[PDB]
Paper text:
Arrestins interact with G protein–coupled receptors (GPCRs) to stop G protein activation and to initiate key signaling pathways. Moreover, βarrs remain associated with desensitized V2R during clathrin-mediated endocytosis, a phenomenon directly linked to specific clusters of phosphorylated residues in the receptor C-terminal tail (V2RCter). Here, we describe the cryo–electron microscopy (cryo-EM) structure of the AVP-bound wild-type human V2R in complex with a truncated form of human βarr1 stabilized by the single-chain variable fragment of Fab30 (ScFv30).
Phosphorylated sites of the V2R carboxyl terminus are clearly identified and interact extensively with the β-arrestin1 N-lobe, in agreement with structural data obtained with chimeric or synthetic systems. Clear interactions between the Cter of V2R and the N-lobe of βarr1 are visualized in the density map of the locally refined βarr1ΔCT-ScFv30 subcomponents. On the basis of the density map, the phosphoproteomic results, and previous structural data, we confidently built the interactions between negatively charged phosphates of the V2RCter residues and positively charged K/R residues of the βarr1 N-lobe (distances less than 4 Å). Phosphates of V2R S357, T359, and T360 are in close proximity to K11 and R25, whereas phosphates of V2R S362, S363, and S364 may establish ionic contacts with R7, K10, and K107 of βarr1, like in the crystal structure of the βarr1-V2Rpp-Fab30 (18) and in the structure of the M2R-βarr1 and β1AR-βarr1 complexes, where both GPCRs have a V2RCter fused instead of their natural sequence. The phosphorylation pattern of V2R we identified in the structure of the AVP-V2R-βarr1ΔCT-ScFv30 complex (and in the phosphoproteomic analysis) corresponds to the one in the crystal structure of the fully phosphorylated V2R in complex with βarr1 (18, 37). The ScFv30 interacts with both βarr1ΔCT N- and C-lobes. On the basis of the density map with a better global resolution of 4.2 Å, the different loops of the active form of βarr1ΔCT were confidently assigned and modeled. The conformation of FL, ML, and LL from N-lobe on one side and that of CL and β strand 16 from C-lobe on the other side circumscribe a specific furrow (red arrow), which takes a major part in the specific orientation between the receptor and the βarr1 (see below).
Residue numbers in the entry:
A (entry chain A): 356 to 368
B (entry chain D): 3 to 110, 128 to 248
C (entry chain C): 6 to 331, 339 to 366
């Protein structure tokens, strides 16, 4: 009964 | 299940002192568990970049990497006359970690392997890896086969600090790994041998307490199988 | 760079965090700064809060049986998130503003302050048949959509994620710790003398530690056998101190030092998990979900601290044991030292099967 940890990205400055 | 790291720039040349790019396509989401190496004709393949971003110690900054999604790019702003080699892309988020075939580009601490040679089909043999200057209990040990004219493939691994042994499917219960921590050595016994076994195998250092790229390896040893003597 | 994200079961709640660890800068620990993504359409109860706590599983069994969740809460704090208070105002951090630019006004930041004197994220080695949560010390970030904190937080109405505190070796290595003794005997005109020392003070896990020992055995008696024990002084303050200790590295030598003799020799010891796997109750560092970890780092006690933390203290000591011809004439000499992470650089890409 749980979810899943994933990730994401960014841009410098 | 198994992970593939395909390479688009399979064949390049005629490039001198310029910015060139290297694209590895990941068969699955791999985040940053990706590393790139470079290899000369038949030498020890040294580390270039790990986590796609951290360039190694000493390596010229002309080498750079970047990641966009599961897609991976290498830049050389200018090709120094010695840079010509085959450059290998490899994901390391999942066992088995997988290497794709690299990129031929051309123009017109101690660690050593040992114990190789030719063996008849169905034979058995022992491969050794002497290591010096560091410690097995802080460094993982990995054997990787290089089939000539085929990509790289991790085959064997010891976590001495954890005492775990990883192998690949083609060597489940067939090739065994061990390490004499006293002698700082890796040993691998090969059973029931076939044609695929004929390749040059390398042993390679990790940094076990906190994993990173495969940094310094051996000189590689040939293991040949043939029906003749 | 990259940012980690976690979703609530209902989808009403999407937390973004940057790093799953925190640099205990000794003086300070990096603040728990993150952002939450909310859906005001799905949100109907208009009140959202997110909790950080340093919490400890009360040790293993309860009602003499494993189960339940006796979180012995070392510290709890929660923050009003949506709507952000018109009162609480702190400057935004670079990471969080970058996230907002990725997201917009629908996301809302939060900043948690970690005081010193707080335990490092450690966990006790679970026994072989421990299918429950690995009992130990760790920090937890949980988001939820509730009217008030009194509200019985629905697990559906909430999402959770765990975080670990870490420490890294001070750049200056410590001076060599040494210890010398001289044991007199009623039967010996002159006393036995012992000296023990280590190569350095700072150490890294997985690399061997080297001890020198010198002995003057000019008594009527001999030094029969010598035992080398790297031991884990783990102290707990659940209600009071408890110096629960377990050997980690055990080396034996039959190096006989006779009466009227000298001795000096070097030994190497190497802690690791495998040999101590079957020793249930050992202490390891941070523990994410179920993964294999490393051995507990050398927990740092602040010099200015009052040593009154109700947490977990991990220190490491080597002991040399001299057996004598046969009274408790056999003598053990103790030498503390530090065993903990090298300098930090990145995240823990722990190796495991897909």
């Amino acid at each position: 009964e749980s979810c899943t940890t994933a990730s994401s990205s960014l841009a410098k400055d | 299940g198994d992970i593939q790291m395909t390479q688009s720039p399979s064949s390049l040349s005629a490039s001198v002192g310029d910015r060139v790019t290297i694209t590895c396509r990941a068969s699955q989401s791999v985040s940053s568990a990706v590393a790139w190496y470079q290899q000369k004709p038949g030498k020890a393949p040294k580390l270039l970049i790990y986590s796609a971003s951290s360039l190694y110690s000493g390596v010229p900054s002309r080498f750079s990497g970047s990641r966009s999604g599961t897609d991976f790019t290498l830049t050389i702003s200018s090709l120094q006359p010695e840079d010509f080699a085959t450059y290998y892309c490899q994901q390391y988020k999942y066992v088995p970690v997988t290497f794709g075939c690299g990129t031929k580009v051309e123009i017109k601490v101690q660690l050593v392997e040992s114990g190789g040679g030719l063996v008849q089909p169905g034979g058995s043999l022992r491969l050794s890896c002497a290591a010096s200057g560091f410690n097995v209990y802080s460094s993982s040990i990995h054997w990787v086969r290089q089939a000539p004219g085929k990509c790289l493939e991790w085959v064997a691994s010891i976590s001495s600090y954890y005492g775990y042994t990883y192998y690949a499917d083609s060597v489940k219960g067939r090739f065994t790994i061990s390490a004499d921590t006293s002698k700082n050595t890796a040993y691998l016994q090969m059973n029931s041998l076939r044609a695929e076994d004929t390749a040059v195998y390398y042993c390679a250092r990790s940094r076990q307490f906190w994993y990173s790229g495969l940094d310094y390896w051996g000189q590689g040893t040939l293991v040949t199988v043939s029906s003749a003597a | 760079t990259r940012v980690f994200k976690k979703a609530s079961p209902n989808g009403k709640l999407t937390v973004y965090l940057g790093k799953r660890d925190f640099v205990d800068h000794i003086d300070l620990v990096d603040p728990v700064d993150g952002v939450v993504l909310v859906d005001p359409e799905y949100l109907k109860e208009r009140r959202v809060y997110v909790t950080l706590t340093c919490a400890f599983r009360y040790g293993r069994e309860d009602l003499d049986v494993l189960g339940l969740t006796f979180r012995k809460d070392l510290f709890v704090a929660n923050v009003q998130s949506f709507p952000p208070a018109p009162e609480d105002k702190k400057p935004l951090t670079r990471l969080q503003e970058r996230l907002i630019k990725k997201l917009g006004e629908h996301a809302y930041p939060f900043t948690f302050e970690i005081p010193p004197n707080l335990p490092c994220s450690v966990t006790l080695q679970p026994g072989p048949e421990d299918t429950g949560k690995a009992c130990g010390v760790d920090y937890e970030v949980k988001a939820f959509c509730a009217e008030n904190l009194e509200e019985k937080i629905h697990k559906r109405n909430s999402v959770r994620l765990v975080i670990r505190k870490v420490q890294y070796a001070p750049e200056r290595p410590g001076p060599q710790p040494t210890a010398e003794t001289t044991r007199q005997f009623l039967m010996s005109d002159k006393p036995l003398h012992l000296e023990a020392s280590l190569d350095k003070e700072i150490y890294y896990h997985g690399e061997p530690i080297s001890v020198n020992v010198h002995v003057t055995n000019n008594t009527n008696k001999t030094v029969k056998k010598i035992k080398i024990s790297v031991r884990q002084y783990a102290d707990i303050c659940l209600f009071n101190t408890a110096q629960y200790k377990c050997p980690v590295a055990m080396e034996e030598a039959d190096d006989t030092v006779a009466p009227s003799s000298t001795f000096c020799k070097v030994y190497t010891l190497t802690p690791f998990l495998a040999n101590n796997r079957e020793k249930r109750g050992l202490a390891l560092d941070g523990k994410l979900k179920h993964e294999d970890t490393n051995l507990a780092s050398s927990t740092l006690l602040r010099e200015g601290a009052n040593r009154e933390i109700l947490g977990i203290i991990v220190s490491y000591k080597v002991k040399v044991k001299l057996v004598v011809s046969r009274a408790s004439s056999d003598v053990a000499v103790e030498l503390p030292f530090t065993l903990m992470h090298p300098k930090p650089k990145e995240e823990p890409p722990h190796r495991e099967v897909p």
